[PDB]
Design a protein around this ligand. Structure first.
Ligand code: SF4
Ligand SMILES: [Mg+2]
Ligand SMILES: [Mg+2]
Ligand SMILES: [Mg+2]
Ligand SMILES: [Mg+2]
Ligand SMILES: [Mg+2]
Ligand SMILES: [Mg+2]
Ligand SMILES: [Mg+2]
Ligand SMILES: [Mg+2]
Ligand SMILES: [Mg+2]
Ligand SMILES: [Mg+2]
Ligand SMILES: [Mg+2]
Ligand SMILES: [Mg+2]
Ligand SMILES: [Mg+2]
Ligand SMILES: [Mg+2]
Ligand SMILES: [Mg+2]
Ligand SMILES: [Mg+2]
Ligand SMILES: [Mg+2]
Ligand SMILES: [Mg+2]
Ligand SMILES: [Mg+2]
Ligand SMILES: [Mg+2]
Ligand SMILES: [Mg+2]
Ligand SMILES: [Mg+2]
Ligand SMILES: [Mg+2]
Ligand SMILES: [Mg+2]
Ligand SMILES: [Mg+2]
Ligand SMILES: [Mg+2]
Ligand SMILES: [Mg+2]
Ligand SMILES: [Mg+2]
Ligand SMILES: [Mg+2]
Ligand SMILES: [Mg+2]
Ligand SMILES: [Mg+2]
Ligand SMILES: [Mg+2]
Ligand SMILES: [Mg+2]
Ligand SMILES: [Mg+2]
Ligand SMILES: [Mg+2]
Ligand SMILES: [Mg+2]
Ligand SMILES: [Mg+2]
Ligand SMILES: [Mg+2]
Ligand SMILES: [Mg+2]
Ligand SMILES: [Mg+2]
Ligand SMILES: [Mg+2]
Ligand SMILES: [Mg+2]
Ligand SMILES: [Mg+2]
Ligand SMILES: [Mg+2]
Ligand SMILES: [Mg+2]
Ligand SMILES: [Mg+2]
Ligand SMILES: [Mg+2]
Ligand SMILES: [Mg+2]
Ligand SMILES: [Mg+2]
Ligand SMILES: [Mg+2]
Ligand SMILES: [Mg+2]
Ligand SMILES: [Mg+2]
Ligand SMILES: [Mg+2]
Ligand SMILES: [Mg+2]
Ligand SMILES: [Mg+2]
Ligand SMILES: [Mg+2]
Ligand SMILES: [Mg+2]
Ligand SMILES: [Mg+2]
Ligand SMILES: [Mg+2]
Ligand SMILES: [Mg+2]
Ligand SMILES: [Mg+2]
Ligand SMILES: [Mg+2]
Ligand SMILES: [Mg+2]
Lengths: 208, 122, 148, 75, 82, 137, 99
RNA sequence: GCUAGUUGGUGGGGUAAUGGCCCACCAAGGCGACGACGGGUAGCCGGUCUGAGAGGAUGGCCGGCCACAGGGGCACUGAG
RNA sequence: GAGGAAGAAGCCCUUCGGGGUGUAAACUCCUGAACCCGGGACGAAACCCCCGACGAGGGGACUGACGGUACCGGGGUAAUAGCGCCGGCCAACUCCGUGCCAGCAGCCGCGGUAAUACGGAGGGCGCGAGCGUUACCCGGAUUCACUGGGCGUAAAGGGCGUGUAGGCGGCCUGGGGCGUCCCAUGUGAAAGACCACGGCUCAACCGUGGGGGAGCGUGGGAUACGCUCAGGCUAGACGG
RNA sequence: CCGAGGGUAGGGCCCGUGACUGGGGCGGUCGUAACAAGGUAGCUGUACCGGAAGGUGCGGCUGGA
């Protein structure tokens, strides 16, 4: 299904913190900051010139990894963007961003991409009052997303949200704190996001 | 050729020849071993290369190859063949599929076991 | 001070009595990614000598390349001997859709969204030059207009 | 001729039955298209051909029978 | 004769009929003469019945013969309201 | 002489690449129609009717470009490219939807229509089509 | 409509009937160029009136005989032996195409 | 290179109805390198797969038409 | 799922210093697929019955295979991972075994005692209830080239004329309007494709709407080019 | 009368096969024709001859001085 397995090793192989694992990412004991080189035996050995296609490969993989998504679901979206009117690097990035599992993370109901999935899955989120437990759910603008009843009062969601007082969630959303709802406002601009990824090489990659 | 030449003589569409006619033209075919020897390959390869003549359900009688280290095949072993040519061995159009019918998988193989039909380790 | 990006290192052979003898060919493109490229092809006894050499020549040979919004301004086919390159402008969501050589030119010429197709003899060295003097023949609506 | 195809099937059906049919195809200058059979005991072999010839009228002669050896050539 | 009937579309456990004029003898989901409205029997939306009253009455007019369920629907779109 | 229109276009193309000021082409009305568009569109200076050894010709006056700097200093041509598109051996008619937009608009396409010999953009404006004659850039 | 064709009478030698040749032009599906093509229609003439050479119109009709389903509508030319000869030429040429 | 019901005529027979559809007489015609005749293969489309596009390849499910009901032939009933 | 060592054991590598699997595990916490428990559908409203007329209109009643299912509410256990690859194309490298053997292979080609190419292991890349193989189609193949190829020497100019069909055809004016172009109109079924929206928690699926187009019938208009007929010309051709 | 079809006879095309017999492709014997003027410049249509490449005549070509 999802990935499940060592997530750190990824961030070495890809060469950057795709923030993938909660509070730790921001420690001085996060994997990157300790040992920022590929997993494995030859992790330390001198690099060879990366092949043209190789470059495009990691890039596609850097992105996908960030959203912990199956390469099937991934490519399906990517095709949707092409058929869609607009900038494909861009619209890809947003069609990707409208993911319910993601929106929960973006609202900080959960600490991490990964975690967001489990919340959504055990129906802790609800879109527009009605409950939703598909993490693929495509959030439209003006969807009201929130924890609902029997978990609003839960050790975790409180903790993450307690910790959500004095931070500002990103420009394309909104957040009724401790009420525990947020609003998808509008689909993001490529430049609101500031992922370490070059949406263009991905496009390039699905060309060959 | 002038356009008039094209109207007159058309362009001739290509057409292709099967490298695999004995399969006739199924994805696999079953057969019965008539001979089971080793063959030497052409230069510059040197080996004692395992091979089996086969009589296919399709009618044809063809010769096929036994991939993997060691085989329990012998005459009248009934086996199925898949398309696949050996470059070294002239006239071996096909491959014999391990792990099917009278053909035991390679015993004790730990890698690429879906090729060579070996069931997974305890 | 530009970027550069070797596209072809290759070895070749002479022949003296009692031995073949070697020489090396590097075919580097160099560019500022803003709209100035320049292809150079240098050769020398050792590899990196032949790569530095390539660099030098390269800069001594840059090119205009207009950039009507990250794409080129009009579709064009040039054909340096037997090899034919075909460039073609494209929408912004497109990316560089190109052979692995002509992309190294386009990339460093700052091109971002274009279509190519290599036709004819697909020798890199040729396809590279074919490409250079194919960019070289681009003109803007203005560029034209002044000509009539 | 005799009836190589008609013989071989006869093996096939018996061969389905039993071990000692028990055929790897073979050929010798005495007769065409002759095959080897080993029979667990002498009697099976004697039953099986006999069955063949009375039943199917494939009246034939079988050479035999073979004991198996531990030859260790000096070379 | 020629009739007005529910022709079934939609999917399994999700019907959506296309109330339709069609000769008796056709298989139901076959070429009909003219679609004259739809009828979602589960009512999953505002519009879930939509006879084209004008045509319905023409067809009716010249001796097409509605089903029972097809007659019952036409009512609810006023076909017979005099 | 099978195609006097190719013949003209050819005369022209040939001429320019040697850098001549003019070249005579045997005169026909239709040809003047092309020359009309060619100068109006700026690919030539213009033309005039004339005469050589008795029989009517057509003198076509040739634009080029500024000199160039470096080795090989020959001027850019104003007519870079000019070929027929409707040989007699192969008549090409095009509908209004189908009128080719040449070179991204940097160049033109003449075409006899029944409202007259127009440019592509004229033909698109009046909203007609017909025999695609040639293309220039 | 019914159907109106135009074309050379390229033979009688039948009773009440005229073999009429009919040309048609159209472009090559793929090669675009224009080609002509042709076909004889046996046409009805109750009054063995229409002689050879003629250019006539013939019209879709109800079956008069197996393979004769057009009447002659009206004459529109005459003496076009030039055409008729072009057919009798292509008919004559054929004995050189055998083996 | 093919054709004697073969191609047209007339008058009958037949059908819901045109027609060598079938029958008698009459004329010598009809078709073909724009590929007749013979041979091979195939159910045909809406569609479908691929492809930048032209194109190529394909006709399973579904919808339309066709054809067959062990291999052949025949008619009966009947609006069919 | 969040946390969790400058980092356990094991196994792999090592220049015997150390590296690696690896936040991975252990482990602390909370969430709770599965299961148990409870309630439980839409699809079904007509023919029928009543008022009124056996009409419109209004009212009332019968009927569920799927199914005690979906779904809802409560309770609730940390709960399957596999497969292909790791010389080059092509993302991913070390040791050991084997010694032109065994074997690998699509193609280059590997293997004849230090094999990143065989077999295993560690490590790595890919994809994941799948991952590979065979078969076949299009693709890459502008490698039948209409778009979009060629024939001095690479395959390719007929040994040479003559000329039948057919292809193609100069300058000007006029009539026709066949081609060609334009407009209206009929047709181009539904399903599919495409755009938008809506319905099943999403999607797949489905519903509703929208635009498509070639084509072909009919009517109306255009006249440059191609055709056809008529007149005229001398730059092509023929003749004195 | 026609008529499924069965039977008689004579043909035509296809496939399988056959003592033997050509050649063809892939893995020691005789020479040494070609590739350097290849030790007689080569090639070539043709004829005759020869174990074998090949030689020779007639004419041609340069892709030979
Ligand atoms: S970011 Fe979070 S996940 Fe990525 S390496 Fe640093 S710690 Fe591990
Ligand atoms: Mg693609
Ligand atoms: Mg060897
Ligand atoms: Mg060798
Ligand atoms: Mg394995
Ligand atoms: Mg410039
Ligand atoms: Mg060229
Ligand atoms: Mg008649
Ligand atoms: Mg008769
Ligand atoms: Mg007679
Ligand atoms: Mg024809
Ligand atoms: Mg069939
Ligand atoms: Mg099929
Ligand atoms: Mg069907
Ligand atoms: Mg029957
Ligand atoms: Mg029967
Ligand atoms: Mg039958
Ligand atoms: Mg009845
Ligand atoms: Mg440490
Ligand atoms: Mg340890
Ligand atoms: Mg350890
Ligand atoms: Mg250690
Ligand atoms: Mg963890
Ligand atoms: Mg554990
Ligand atoms: Mg229950
Ligand atoms: Mg119900
Ligand atoms: Mg793989
Ligand atoms: Mg690699
Ligand atoms: Mg392997
Ligand atoms: Mg070793
Ligand atoms: Mg390999
Ligand atoms: Mg290995
Ligand atoms: Mg799945
Ligand atoms: Mg292919
Ligand atoms: Mg490609
Ligand atoms: Mg192609
Ligand atoms: Mg292509
Ligand atoms: Mg080829
Ligand atoms: Mg072409
Ligand atoms: Mg070529
Ligand atoms: Mg010649
Ligand atoms: Mg010859
Ligand atoms: Mg000859
Ligand atoms: Mg001639
Ligand atoms: Mg002629
Ligand atoms: Mg003509
Ligand atoms: Mg003309
Ligand atoms: Mg017209
Ligand atoms: Mg449709
Ligand atoms: Mg629709
Ligand atoms: Mg005249
Ligand atoms: Mg008979
Ligand atoms: Mg008979
Ligand atoms: Mg009988
Ligand atoms: Mg034979
Ligand atoms: Mg034979
Ligand atoms: Mg010699
Ligand atoms: Mg010699
Ligand atoms: Mg010599
Ligand atoms: Mg000698
Ligand atoms: Mg000679
Ligand atoms: Mg001798
Ligand atoms: Mg001699
Ligand atoms: Mg001589």
């Amino acid at each position: 299904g999802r990935y499940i397995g060592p997530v750190c090793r990824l961030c070495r192989r890809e060469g950057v913190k795709l923030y993938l694992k909660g509070e730790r990412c921001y420690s001085p004991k996060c994997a990157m900051e300790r040992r920022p080189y590929p997993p494995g035996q030859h992790g330390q050995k001198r690099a060879r010139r990366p092949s043209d296609y190789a470059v495009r490969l990691r890039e596609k993989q850097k992105l996908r990894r960030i959203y912990g998504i199956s390469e099937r679901q991934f490519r399906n979206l990517f095709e949707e963007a092409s058929k869609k009117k607009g900038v494909t690097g861009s619209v890809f990035l947003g069609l990707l961003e409208s993911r319910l599992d993601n929106v929960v993370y973006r609202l900080g109901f959960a600490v991490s991409r990964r975690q967001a999935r489990q919340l959504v899955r055990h129906g802790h989120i609800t879109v527009n009052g009605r409950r939703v437990d598909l993490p693929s759910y495509r959030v439209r603008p003006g969807d009201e997303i929130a924890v609902a009843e029997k978990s609003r009062n839960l050790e975790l969601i409180r903790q993450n949200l307690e910790a959500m007082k004095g931070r500002k969630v990103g420009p394309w959303l909104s957040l009724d704190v401790e009420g525990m709802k947020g609003k998808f406002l509008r689909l993001p601009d490529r430049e609101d996001l500031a992922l370490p990824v070059n949406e263009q090489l991905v496009i390039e990659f699905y060309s060959r | 050729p002038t356009i008039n030449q094209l109207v007159r003589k058309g362009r001739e569409k290509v057409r292709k020849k099967s490298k695999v006619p004995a399969l006739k033209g199924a994805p696999f075919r079953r057969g019965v071993c008539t001979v089971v020897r080793t063959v030497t390959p052409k230069k510059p390869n040197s080996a004692l290369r395992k091979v089996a003549k086969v009589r296919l359900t399709s009618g044809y009688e063809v010769t096929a190859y036994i991939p993997g280290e060691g085989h329990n095949l012998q005459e009248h072993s009934v086996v199925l063949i898949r398309g696949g040519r050996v470059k070294d061995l002239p006239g071996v159009r096909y491959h014999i599929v391990r792990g099917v019918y009278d053909a035991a998988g390679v015993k004790d193989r730990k890698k690429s076991r879906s090729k060579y039909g070996t069931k997974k380790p305890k | 001070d530009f970027e550069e990006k070797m596209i072809l290192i290759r070895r070749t052979a002479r022949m003296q009595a009692g031995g073949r003898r070697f020489r090396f060919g590097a075919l580097v493109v160099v560019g500022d990614r803003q709209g100035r490229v320049g292809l150079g092809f240098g050769k020398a006894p050792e590899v990196p000598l032949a790569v530095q050499k390539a660099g030098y020549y390269a800069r001594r040979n840059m090119v205009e390349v207009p950039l009507q919004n990250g794409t080129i301004p009009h579709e064009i086919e040039v054909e340096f001997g037997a090899s034919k390159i075909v460039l073609k402008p494209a929408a912004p969501g497109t990316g560089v859709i190109a052979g692995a050589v002509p992309r190294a030119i386009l990339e460093l010429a700052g091109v971002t969204d274009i279509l190519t197709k290599e036709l004819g003899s697909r020798n890199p060295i040729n396809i590279a030059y074919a490409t250079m003097e194919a960019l070289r023949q681009l003109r803007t609506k203005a560029d034209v207009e002044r000509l009539r | 001729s005799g009836d190589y195809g008609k013989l071989r099937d006869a093996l096939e059906k018996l061969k389905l039955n039993d071990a000692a049919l028990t055929f790897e195809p073979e050929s010798s200058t005495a007769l065409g298209f002759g095959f080897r059979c080993g029979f667990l005991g002498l009697l099976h072999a004697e039953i099986v051909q006999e069955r063949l010839e009375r039943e199917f009228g494939l009246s034939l002669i079988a050479t035999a029978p073979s004991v198996v050896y531990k030859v260790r050539l000096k070379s | 004769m020629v009739k007005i009937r529910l022709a079934r579309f939609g999917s399994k456990h999700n019907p959506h009929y296309r109330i339709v004029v069609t000769d008796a003898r056709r298989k139901r989901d076959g070429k009909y003469i003219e679609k004259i409205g739809y009828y979602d029997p589960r009512k999953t939306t505002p519009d879930w019945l939509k006879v084209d009253v004008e045509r319905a009455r023409y067809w009716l007019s010249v001796g097409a013969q509605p089903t029972d369920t097809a007659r019952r629907l036409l009512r609810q779109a006023g076909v017979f309201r005099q | 002489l099978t195609d006097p229109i190719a013949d003209m276009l050819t005369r022209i193309r040939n001429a320019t690449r040697v850098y001549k000021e003019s070249t005579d082409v045997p005169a026909s009305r239709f040809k003047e129609e092309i020359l009309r568009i060619l100068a109006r569109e700026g690919f030539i200076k213009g033309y005039e009717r004339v005469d050589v050894d008795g029989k009517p010709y057509l003198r076509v006056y040739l634009k080029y470009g500024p000199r160039r700097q470096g080795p090989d200093p020959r001027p850019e041509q104003v007519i870079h490219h000019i070929r027929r598109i409707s040989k007699p051996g192969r008549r090409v008619y095009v509908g209004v939807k189908e009128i080719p937009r040449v070179r991204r608009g940097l160049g033109i396409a003449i075409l006899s229509t029944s409202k007259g010999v127009l440019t592509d953009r004229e033909a698109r404006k009046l909203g007609v089509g017909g025999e695609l004659i040639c293309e220039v850039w | 409509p019914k159907k109106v064709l135009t074309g050379v009478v390229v033979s009688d030698k039948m009773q009440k009937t005229v073999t009429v040749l009919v040309e048609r032009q159209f472009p090559h599906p793929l090669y675009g160029k224009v080609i002509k093509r042709s076909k004889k229609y046996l046409a009805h003439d109750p009054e063995e009136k229409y002689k050879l050479g003629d250019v006539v119109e013939i019209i879709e009709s109800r079956p008069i005989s197996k393979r004769k389903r057009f009447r002659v509508l009206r004459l529109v030319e005459s003496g076009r032996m030039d055409l008729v000869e072009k057919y009798l030429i292509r008919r004559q040429n054929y004995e050189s195409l055998s083996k």
